[PDB]
C-alpha cells in the first residue's frame, strides 16, 4: 500500500510541472495579453484623429484643385 504510494505520489508532483509550467509559460503570453489589452484603445485614438486630420487634408484638398480653375 505504501511502496506504490511511495512511488505514485512522488511521481504525481512532477507530472503537474511541465504542463503546468507550460500553463504558466502559456500565460506568460497572457502576461503580455492582460497587459497589452489597451493597445487597441490607444490605437483607436489615432484612427479618428488622423481621420480627423485627413478631413482637413480633404478640406485642404479642395483648396488645391479649385485654385486651378479660378486663377486660369
Amino acid at each position: 500500500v505504501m511502496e506504490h504510494l511511495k512511488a505514485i505520489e512522488p511521481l504525481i508532483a512532477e507530472i503537474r510541472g511541465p504542463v503546468s509550467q507550460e500553463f504558466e509559460a502559456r500565460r506568460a503570453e497572457h502576461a503580455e495579453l492582460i497587459a497589452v489589452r489597451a493597445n487597441l484603445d490607444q490605437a483607436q485614438r489615432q484612427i479618428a484623429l488622423i481621420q480627423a486630420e485627413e478631413r482637413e487634408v480633404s478640406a485642404r484638398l479642395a483648396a488645391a484643385e479649385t485654385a486651378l480653375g479660378e486663377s486660369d
Partner: nanobody
Amino acid sequence: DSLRLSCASSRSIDGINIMRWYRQAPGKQRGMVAVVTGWGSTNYVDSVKGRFIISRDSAKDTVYLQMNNLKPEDTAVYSCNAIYRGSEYWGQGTQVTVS
C-alpha cells in the same frame, strides 16, 4: 579525446538577446555553465575554466565548445537556453560521458 556540442537554430536567428547553456548533474537542479550575449562576451561557470570556450555565429546561430580534460563529474546532461520579451525558452538537453 574530443566530443563537440552543437546547439543549432531553425527559427529566429541571432535576433536574440543573451542565450545560455545548462547542465543538470545527477540529483540536482539546473544552472548556468557558459553564456554569450548580443555583445557576445564569453563567460562561463568556474568548473570549466580554460576547459569550456564559447562562441557565436550570426548565420548558423549555433554555439560550440570544447569538452575534454575530463572529470568523473562530467557525466551529466547538457543543454541550451534563450529568452525574449519577458518569456524564457529551454532547449532539448542531452547526455554527456566522462570515462
